Amino acid sequence: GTILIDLSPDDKEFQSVEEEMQSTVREHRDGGHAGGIFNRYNILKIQKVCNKKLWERYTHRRKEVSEENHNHANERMLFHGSPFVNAIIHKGFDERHAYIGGMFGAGIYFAENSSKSNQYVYGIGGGTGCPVHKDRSCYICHRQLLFCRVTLGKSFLQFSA
Amino acid sequence: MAHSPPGHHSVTGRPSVNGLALAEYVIYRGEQAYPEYLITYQIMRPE
Ligand SMILES: O=c1cc(-c2ccccc2)oc2ccc(Cl)cc12
Numbered sequence: 001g002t003i004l005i006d007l008s009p010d011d012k013e014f015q016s017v018e019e020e021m022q023s024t025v026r027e028h029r030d031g032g033h034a035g036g037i038f039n040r041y042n043i044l045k046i047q048k049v050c051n052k053k054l055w056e057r058y059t060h061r062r063k064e065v066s067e068e069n070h071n072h073a074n075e076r077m078l079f080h081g082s083p084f085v086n087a088i089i090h091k092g093f094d095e096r097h098a099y100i101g102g103m104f105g106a107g108i109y110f111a112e113n114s115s116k117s118n119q120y121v122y123g124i125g126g127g128t129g130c131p132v133h134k135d136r137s138c139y140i141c142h143r144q145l146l147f148c149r150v151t152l153g154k155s156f157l158q159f160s161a
Numbered sequence: 162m163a164h165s166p167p168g169h170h171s172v173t174g175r176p177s178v179n180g181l182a183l184a185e186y187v188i189y190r191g192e193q194a195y196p197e198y199l200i201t202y203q204i205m206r207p208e
């Protein structure tokens with residue numbers, strides 16, 4: 001039931017999503033090893049993901065969390081980078097999209113920095129880079145990130161390096 | 162897939178060294194996220 005609707009670059013929604021993508025780029029401590037060397041992106045397309053069933057699945061859970069947290073879902077918009085974007089947009093997030101070895105245990109990880117999610121587009125640590133050129137810093141191959149609505153509810157604060 | 166800490170619905174990873182890093186977050190139920198936008202892009206080689 002998923003359909004993808006292209007946004008016009010003239011659309012205010014295209015423009016606010018691009019700005020959140022571009023302005024949350026930072027330098028990484030790996031010097032670009034995992035995600036490549038860049039200060040900005042060339043945005044090729046932004047599509048709105050529409051799936052009734054997945055959305056109702058989200059809003060059902062959102063309301064459960066909210067009623068457990070004084071009517072506050074603590075909803076954020078966050079980036080997610082994965083080799084499995086095409087399975088996610090059709091079937092939703094599940095256990096198969098978890099980072100089993102992540103710093104905070106086996107769960108589904110999201111970032112405020114788009115450049116952090118970009119380090120995972122081609123796998124953990126960037127895997128072996130783009131499928132065509134085996135280059136974690138490929139400037140040619142098209143990459144995909146998701147910009148996602150995430151319910152945090154009451155979040156456990158972990159301080160970290 | 163692990164569980165949230167008791168009494169919590171997610172984990173926030175707060176940066177404690179890299180003064181420029183923003184936060185990272187973890188959820189433990191797939192139903193707690195909806196993939197709203199698919200962004201197709203290239204990284205750009207700095208000039
Ligand atoms: O966006 C991410 C996707 C993924 C990811 C992990 C395993 C499989 C697929 C994607 O890892 C992350 C780890 C930390 C942060 Cl902050 C963000 C990500």
Ligand SMILES: [Zn+2]
Pocket residue numbers: 130131132133134135138139140141
């Ligand atoms: Zn390539």
